[PDB]
Amino acid sequence: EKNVSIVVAASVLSSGIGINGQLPWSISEDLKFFSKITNNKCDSNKKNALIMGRKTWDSIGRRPLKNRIIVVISSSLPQDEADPNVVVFRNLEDSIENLMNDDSIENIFVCGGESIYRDALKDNFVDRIYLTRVALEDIEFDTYFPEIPETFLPVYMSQTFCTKNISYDFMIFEKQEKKLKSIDDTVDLLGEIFGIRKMGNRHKFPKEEIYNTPSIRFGREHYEFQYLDLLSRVLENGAYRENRTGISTYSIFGQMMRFDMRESFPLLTTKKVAIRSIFEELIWFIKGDTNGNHLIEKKVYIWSGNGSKEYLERIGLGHREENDLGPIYGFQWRHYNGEYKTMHDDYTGVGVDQLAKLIETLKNNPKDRRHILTAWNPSALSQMALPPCHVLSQYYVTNDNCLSCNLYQRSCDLGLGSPFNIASYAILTMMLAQVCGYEPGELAIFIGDAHIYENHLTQLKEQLSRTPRPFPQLKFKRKVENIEDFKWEDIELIGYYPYPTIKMDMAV
Amino acid sequence: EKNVSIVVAASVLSSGIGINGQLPWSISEDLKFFSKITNNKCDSNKKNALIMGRKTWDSIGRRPLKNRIIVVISSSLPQDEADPNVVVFRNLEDSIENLMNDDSIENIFVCGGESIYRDALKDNFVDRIYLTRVALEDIEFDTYFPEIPETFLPVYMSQTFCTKNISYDFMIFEKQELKSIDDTVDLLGEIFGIRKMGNRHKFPKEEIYNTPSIRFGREHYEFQYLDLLSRVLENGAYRENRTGISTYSIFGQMMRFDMRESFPLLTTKKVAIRSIFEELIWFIKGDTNGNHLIEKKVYIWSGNGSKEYLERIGLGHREENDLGPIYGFQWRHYNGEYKTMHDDYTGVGVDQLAKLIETLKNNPKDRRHILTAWNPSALSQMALPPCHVLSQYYVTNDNCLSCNLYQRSCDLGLGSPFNIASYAILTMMLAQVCGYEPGELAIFIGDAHIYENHLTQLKEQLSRTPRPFPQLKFKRKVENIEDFKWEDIELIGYYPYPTIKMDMAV
Ligand SMILES: NC(=O)C1=CN([C@@H]2O[C@H](COP(=O)(O)OP(=O)(O)OC[C@H]3O[C@@H](n4cnc5c(N)ncnc54)[C@H](OP(=O)(O)O)[C@@H]3O)[C@@H](O)[C@H]2O)C=CC1
Ligand SMILES: NC(=O)C1=CN([C@@H]2O[C@H](COP(=O)(O)OP(=O)(O)OC[C@H]3O[C@@H](n4cnc5c(N)ncnc54)[C@H](OP(=O)(O)O)[C@@H]3O)[C@@H](O)[C@H]2O)C=CC1
Ligand SMILES: CN(Cc1cnc2nc(N)nc(N)c2n1)c1ccc(C(=O)N[C@@H](CCC(=O)O)C(=O)O)cc1
Ligand SMILES: CN(Cc1cnc2nc(N)nc(N)c2n1)c1ccc(C(=O)N[C@@H](CCC(=O)O)C(=O)O)cc1
Ligand SMILES: N#Cc1ccc(CC(=O)O)c(NC(=O)c2ccc(Cc3c[nH]c4nc(N)[nH]c(=O)c34)cc2)c1
Ligand SMILES: N#Cc1ccc(CC(=O)O)c(NC(=O)c2ccc(Cc3c[nH]c4nc(N)[nH]c(=O)c34)cc2)c1
Ligand SMILES: O=c1[nH]c(=O)n([C@H]2C[C@H](O)[C@@H](COP(=O)(O)O)O2)cc1F
Ligand SMILES: O=c1[nH]c(=O)n([C@H]2C[C@H](O)[C@@H](COP(=O)(O)O)O2)cc1F
């Protein structure tokens, strides 16, 4: 009655595992994971059994694996008794007799090609699945991993790792069966006595119907959950509130999201995100530009709503040209406190250049605690087409020469602005890291008013029904001299396999 | 084999539970907690047994409690068989016969005065302890709860609640006697050294974790500060800075505090609340004169405002304590041309605080209640750049005022407790002037660090189990936010641990 687990590394979409008798990739850390998970035992006087098919036995050179016993399933191989570390069986059913007569075997691992995988799943021999999702799909496969049956549920999904620009995950699946202690009861009783006087009741845990992949309870390591859980928390505790637009929101206050940038790029996979528009807006900020037409001329329409004749006249800026957004992010980054006139004037030399001072300080005094870039200028708020949402950012150089970023966001549209903000400040930190000579670190986003617009409810709930996939990789094709020299052609997005786009309208 | 639990409400320091045959307090929610915890059962055809002494049986009027069976320990009361809800036993040992006989009893609760408590603990009959710590100590007691034996460890400590300006907690004590997900995470952590972000955010070891036995019940929001200390001690990188005292630093941290039922003033260390208030009202008035704080026996800005320090950072033209345009000058005169600490600035710059107050009561659901202090044009003139850089304020649907604060650099030994209390008081001041109630306080930290000369001190502070937060009330309602005085502040139920001396790094 010992445990039987599948160990497999398959592609993220088509679940390919092999091609021409070998693997479609070469990931060293994945093999180490196979080695450590198949050697993991509890009894020093027992060994683990690794079951594999004959063709898989050929692909590993027909040589034994240390500290383990390999069980080859073959109809033609001679049942040789010379090697005690390799044993041959004529069928998979007869091979699963290490449970009974062989008390010297502690755990059993199935890992031997499509034929053995499919037979082990069809006959319900498998209890656990150790899946390594690999972000490679536009290549050739001839051997696939079977679709995981509905009797299995995911219980763990690791963060995204990177090897030679290849993104990969680690997941565990458990086969469902039938059907502290008093701390939960005491907390529930306290919540019944104190209604909303108990702060726990104002931060209720999301219900299962709005929880992304609810079967993953204690292993929600993938940092896309940092965004999906915020959606669920809003759906559970968001107060219905009006705002300056005609579209009400469900809002909560004081939230946090954390993302890794060392081994992945925080571009959401549960929805296809317009990465090009994000980059074009970011380089538009860096150049100090406030002319909205330059984004529209590059097929980027995210600032069209807040820069129309009707919207500008409504907020009392009818004197402006159609897309003259005024002194905003790009103008406070390069010309802070500069007297703004129009989008056509020359501002070279005006205001404080925070971005230049930031870059100079990052490489000359890295351990300084004042790497701050702000956009909140109370003297210029009335002239802006929209006050800053990503208000302030701080940057940090670790001891191992990595650049981390903290961002405070006063207002967060979780449907549209939030994924853009995550990717935008990830790219910005990477740009600062390359110009200053560091590596990307971490990205923390601290949110004030985190809200969901009521016309996004059907869409975001749809997005919550999609299990996340490994984050992609973002690499720069060339090293630039000035941070303003980055071009969209210099960006390489590797291994991005998202779910279909989800259309959502912006509230003007 | 059946469960035996003590339910008791005792004072926070002396563990007093009674006076003159009655309770030393009147907390309605505590009685409701007693009712819910003693009625909590699993079988609908069973009842719970409440064991109490005779004097306690007298104090409750000698009347039965619904749905439960009261067991009175007395040597004189007649063993009457008329009332089935009240049964009398001659001693506590013989009374613990609900274990073997009477299968109709599911759980057993001991709750009957000092004599029964002490006997139940001395004979090792008790498995669990439900303690309600009450923040009342300068009153008279004649009945005390025994000192909890070392065989018990706390497993839960609730947030601080308030009833009639009385702070109280809820704790659980236990007597000491997935699966493969943790293994897979450990294996992945062995393969990827610090490439796995979990290894860069390691869970603190037990030796630096405050009350490590409370694992799943760290509800008390003082843990939001103590655990941050532990995280720094576990993952902090040793780094140099502008001062001669190196720190252990981490980046990107968060603390959350409740202000509806308590005031976030740390109990594991006596915090100078008066100096915090005087600094805050000094900010609100728009004052940059460091002498006005020194004249009020507040010396927190003496180090960053000396002749030697100002000359060192290139401000030798300044007067002794002319700190320059800092907190409160950017609040009241943002972008205002700063001259000296004595000039008249009435009307210059943008008054963020006034606009903030006006917007909070005229447009509460606005998403732009922002108060900033980071002025890149004035950084060179400041004696010290702002640490609490930016704050945002939020009006809930039930007319509560919450506050978010971003802090670029956080001295966890000295500045952090001051910052927590300071912005707590500021939110309360804004709430009263705008006509709201205090809400929540979230603090987002960039460079959270511990100075190396605070290591012995902070580890000492981590050895102290937290106590209920106190209460902060205003004695009068003011017309303008600048009119608050220290005499208008009432700090109720503050019973901290001894002060811990720590030197500031200049
Ligand atoms: N990414 C990953 O995790 C893994 C990938 N792979 C890859 O997959 C490929 C190999 O898989 P695959 O092509 O399906 O071959 P298999 O590994 O499944 O081995 C098949 C052989 O096993 C024997 N066999 C299979 N079923 C039975 C049965 N019901 N009764 C008796 N004997 C049986 C047969 O050998 P015989 O002819 O002797 O009778 C058969 O030819 C390789 O490219 C390999 O590298 C393999 C393992 C893991
Ligand atoms: N804050 C809280 O949670 C609680 C507080 N209290 C307070 O504490 C006070 C009461 O406690 P306390 O003064 O200690 O009195 P007790 O409630 O402990 O009752 C004592 C009586 O129980 C009987 N008794 C005790 N021990 C024995 C024994 N070993 N054998 C036989 N009979 C025994 C005796 O009754 P007899 O004379 O008949 O022999 C004795 O007089 C009250 O003020 C009450 O309000 C009470 C409960 C809870
Ligand atoms: C059957 N097979 C193909 C193969 C390749 N990648 C996989 N990856 C996963 N996640 N799961 C599998 N079953 C798997 N199988 C294998 C099996 C073992 C070794 C191997 O060389 N293992 C060494 C690992 C060497 C190392 O430390 O790098 C060991 O000690 O177990 C290679 C391919
Ligand atoms: C023995 N005793 C004194 C008393 C008072 N406060 C306490 N508080 C605690 N935490 N623990 C105790 N053992 C305790 N005991 C009692 C016991 C029951 C009631 C009582 O009236 N209980 C009603 C409560 C009525 C209501 O809902 O408020 C019930 O239904 O249980 C009062 C005092
Ligand atoms: N899925 C998806 C998806 C598909 C296409 C697009 C447009 C594009 O790819 O070009 C988008 N993004 C936006 O349509 C978008 C995203 C961010 C902003 C910033 C912004 C400015 N002012 C705002 N005011 C409100 N209220 N909220 C906001 O997000 C903003 C404005 C628009 C998302
Ligand atoms: N326990 C304790 C305890 C006991 C007494 C006092 C002083 C008093 O009660 O009056 C204190 N607080 C301070 O001594 C103190 C607290 C906060 C500051 C703000 C500050 C300005 N510049 C700083 N620079 C550094 N590096 N760090 C800092 O905290 C500050 C400066 C000093 C703490
Ligand atoms: O980068 C952005 N991120 C974002 O979340 N918004 C959304 C938040 C909110 O829905 C709206 C701002 O309206 P308000 O000023 O009332 O917060 O824009 C806008 C951006 F430009
Ligand atoms: O409110 C404050 N909080 C705080 O933590 N500091 C500490 C943080 C740091 O130890 C020092 C500033 O050093 P630096 O300018 O390098 O961030 O002041 C100062 C304040 F005024």
CATH code, domain with B163: 3.40.430.10
What value, to the nearest 5°, has the Cα angle with vertex A131 and ends A130 and A135? Answer: 160
**How many other CB atoms are there within 10 angstroms of residue A440's CB atom?**
24
Choose the catalytic residue: B387, B403, B410, B434.
B387
As given in the structure block, the two tokens for residue B237 are 């990188």
SS3 state of residue A161:
strand
B/e letters for B372-400, b = 16+ CB within 10 Å, e = fewer, are bbbbbebbeebbbbbbbbbbbbbbbeeeb
Same domain, residue pair B169 and B128: yes
Phi, psi of A5 (to 5 degrees): -125, 140
- Residue B104: what residue type? S
Q: Which residues line ligand 3 (CB under 6 A)?
A: A 7-9, 23, 28, 30-35, 52, 56, 60, 65-66, 111, 132
Instruction: Identify all chain B residues contacting A29, using CB atoms and an 8 Å cutoff.
Output: 191-192
**Do residues A228 and A429 touch, judged by C-beta distance below 8 A?**
no
Same domain, residue pair A231 and A368: yes
As given in the structure block, the two tokens for residue B97 are 């016969």
| Helix runs in A374-451, H state only | 417-436
Write out A242-279 in H/E/C secondary structure. Answer: CCCCCCCEEEEEEEEEEEECCCCCCCCCCCCCCHHHHH
Phi, psi of B471 (to 5 degrees): -120, 145
CA dihedral A314→A315→A320→A322, nearest 10 degrees, is -50
Distance CA A219, CA B185 (A): 9
**What share of residues in chain B are helix, strand, coil (percent, to 5)?**
30, 25, 45
Q: How was this structure determined?
A: X-ray
Q: Residue A301 contacts by C-beta under 8 Å, 6 or more apart in sequence?
A: A295
Which ligand approaches the C-alpha of residue A144 most closely?
1
Task: Give B153-208 as a DSSP string.
Answer: EEEEE---EEETTEEE--EEEEE----HHHHHHHHHHHHSSSSSHHHHTPPPPGGG
Asked whether the beta carbons of residue B254 and residue A192 sit closer than 8 angstroms, the reply is no
**Do residues A278 and A286 touch, judged by C-beta distance below 8 A?**
no
- Residue A99: what residue type? L
Distance CA A219, CA A154 (A): 9
SS3 state of residue A160:
coil
Identify which of B302, B382, B180 has the alpha carbon closest to the alpha carbon of residue A109.
B180
Computed on alpha carbons and rounded to an integer, the radius of gyration of chain B in Å comes to 27
Would you call A389 a catalytic residue per the annotation? yes
Distance CA A258, CA A252 (A): 18
As given in the structure block, the two tokens for residue B133 are 């710590």
**What count of Cα atoms within 13 Å lies in the side-chain half-sphere of residue A360?**
5
- Residue A40: what residue type? N
As given in the structure block, the two tokens for residue B192 are 């990827």
Q: Residue A62 contacts by C-beta under 8 Å, 6 or more apart in sequence?
A: none
**What count of Cα atoms within 13 Å lies in the side-chain half-sphere of residue A236?**
19
CA of A157 to the centre of ligand 1 (A): 27
As given in the structure block, the two tokens for residue A472 are 């992609």
Does the annotation place A424 within a ligand binding site? Answer: no
Closest partner residue to B409 (CB to CB) among A130, A369, A448 is: A369
- Chain-centroid distance of CA A459 in Å reads 19
**Do residues B426 and B402 touch, judged by C-beta distance below 8 A?**
no
SS3 state of residue A183:
helix
Same domain, residue pair A208 and A239: no
**What count of Cα atoms within 13 Å lies in the side-chain half-sphere of residue A154?**
22
Distance CA A419, CA A463 (A): 12
What value, to the nearest 5°, has the Cα angle with vertex B193 and ends B192 and B194? Answer: 105
Same domain, residue pair B262 and B326: yes
SS3 state of residue B76:
coil
Question: What is the maximal distance between C-alpha atoms in chain A?
Answer: 92
Task: Determine the residue among A376, A411, A413 to mutate to test chain B binding: the one whose Cβ has the most chain B Cβ atoms within 10 Å.
Answer: A376
Identify which of B297, B272, B306, B301 has the alpha carbon closest to the alpha carbon of residue B287.
B301
Identify the burial level of A492 via C-beta atoms within 10 angstroms of its C-beta, where 0-12 means exposed, 13-18 middle and 19 or more buried: exposed
Same domain, residue pair B62 and B3: yes
Q: Residue B408 contacts by C-beta under 8 Å, 6 or more apart in sequence?
A: A369, A370, A372, A394, B385, B386, B387, B389, B446, B447
List C-alpha distances in Å: A376 to A289, A409, A410, B329, B371.
Answer: 17, 11, 10, 16, 9
Q: For B397, left (φ over 0), alpha (ψ -120 to 50), or beta? A: alpha
Distance CA A350, CA A109 (A): 67
**What count of Cα atoms within 13 Å lies in the side-chain half-sphere of residue B140?**
5
Does the annotation place A369 within a ligand binding site? Answer: no
Distance CA A329, CA A393 (A): 12
**Do residues A244 and A413 touch, judged by C-beta distance below 8 A?**
no
**Do residues A25 and A166 touch, judged by C-beta distance below 8 A?**
yes
Task: Give B476-503 as a DSSP string.
Answer: S--SSGGG--GGGEEEES--PPPP---P
B37 lines ligand 2 (CB under 6 A): no
Same domain, residue pair A309 and A193: no
**Do residues A87 and A80 touch, judged by C-beta distance below 8 A?**
no
**Do residues A421 and A255 touch, judged by C-beta distance below 8 A?**
no
Closest partner residue to B192 (CB to CB) among A161, A192, A391 is: A161
Phi, psi of A18 (to 5 degrees): -155, 165
SS3 state of residue B140:
coil
A458 in contact with chain B, both atoms CB, cutoff 8 A: no
Task: Give A339-360 as a DSSP string.
Answer: ----SSS--TT-SB-HHHHHHH
CA of A46 to the centre of ligand 8 (A): 57
Which residues does a chain break follow in chain B (C to N more than 2.5 Å)?
177
Task: Give B221-248 as a DSSP string.
Answer: TTHHHHHHHHHHHHH-EEE--SSSS-EE
Distance CA B470, CA B12 (A): 12
Phi, psi of B119 (to 5 degrees): -70, -35
**CATH number where B187 lies:** 3.30.572.10
Question: Which helix (H) or strand (E) element contains residue A173?
Answer: strand A171-175
Same domain, residue pair A507 and A393: yes
The residue whose two tokens read 């001991």 is B110
Question: Which helix (H) or strand (E) element contains residue A128?
Answer: strand A128-134
As given in the structure block, the two tokens for residue B82 are 């008329």
Q: State how many domains chain B has.
A: 3
As given in the structure block, the two tokens for residue A486 are 């980055």
B401 lines ligand 2 (CB under 6 A): no
Q: A478: which strand partners? A: none
Identify which of B401, B369, B467 has the alpha carbon closest to the alpha carbon of residue B169.
B467
A356 in contact with chain B, both atoms CB, cutoff 8 A: no
- Residue A25: what residue type? W
Does the annotation place A196 within a ligand binding site? Answer: no
Distance CA A160, CA A226 (A): 13
Phi, psi of A175 (to 5 degrees): -85, 120
Identify which of A503, A504, A462, A450 has the alpha carbon closest to the alpha carbon of residue A249.
A450
Instruction: Identify all chain B residues contacting A352, using CB atoms and an 8 Å cutoff.
Output: 376-377
Task: Determine the residue among A184, A394, A398, A453 to mutate to test chain B binding: the one whose Cβ has the most chain B Cβ atoms within 10 Å.
Answer: A394
Distance CA A348, CA A53 (A): 69
Between strands B400-411 and B388-395, the pairing is: antiparallel
Identify which of A447, A506, A505 has the alpha carbon closest to the alpha carbon of residue A226.
A447
Q: Residue B335 contacts by C-beta under 8 Å, 6 or more apart in sequence?
A: A337, A378, A379, B349, B350, B375, B377, B378
Q: B157: which strand partners? A: B171, B218
Same domain, residue pair A239 and A267: yes
Distance CA B110, CA B128 (A): 10
List C-alpha distances in Å: A44 to A104, A240, B480.
Answer: 10, 59, 75
Identify which of B158, B236, B145, B235 has the alpha carbon closest to the alpha carbon of residue B198.
B235
As given in the structure block, the two tokens for residue A412 are 């967060």
The residue whose two tokens read 């998979």 is A92
Write out A29-91 in H/E/C secondary structure. Answer: HHHHHHHHHHHCCCCCCCEEEEEEEHHHHHHCCCCCCCCEEEEEECCCCCCCCCCCCEEEECC
- Chain-centroid distance of CA A211 in Å reads 16
Same domain, residue pair A337 and A372: yes
Asked whether the beta carbons of residue A189 and residue B335 sit closer than 8 angstroms, the reply is no
Q: B105: which strand partners? A: B47
What value, to the nearest 5°, has the Cα angle with vertex B138 and ends B136 and B143? Answer: 75
Asked whether the beta carbons of residue B156 and residue A262 sit closer than 8 angstroms, the reply is no
Question: What is the maximal distance between C-alpha atoms in chain B?
Answer: 92
The residue whose two tokens read 């796995």 is B196
Choose the catalytic residue: A162, A389, A412, A436.
A389
As given in the structure block, the two tokens for residue B98 are 């609900």
**Do residues B493 and B135 touch, judged by C-beta distance below 8 A?**
yes
Same domain, residue pair A338 and A436: yes
SS3 state of residue A8:
strand
CA of A264 to the centre of ligand 5 (A): 23
Q: Residue B419 contacts by C-beta under 8 Å, 6 or more apart in sequence?
A: B387, B388, B405, B407, B410, B443
Distance CA B419, CA B388 (A): 8
Same domain, residue pair A170 and A27: yes
The residue whose two tokens read 């990969």 is A168
The residue whose two tokens read 């302030």 is A392
Q: For A254, left (φ over 0), alpha (ψ -120 to 50), or beta? A: left
Between strands B16-18 and A249-260, the pairing is: unpaired
Same domain, residue pair A215 and A236: no
Q: Which domain holds residue A106?
A: 1-176
Distance CA B129, CA B110 (A): 9
Q: Which residues line ligand 7 (CB under 6 A)?
A: A 243-244, 386-387, 389-390, 411-413, 417-418, 421; B 367-368
- Chain-centroid distance of CA B306 in Å reads 34
List C-alpha distances in Å: A236 to A268, A410, A464, B211.
Answer: 22, 21, 13, 32
**Do residues A37 and A171 touch, judged by C-beta distance below 8 A?**
no
Distance CA B494, CA B471 (A): 8
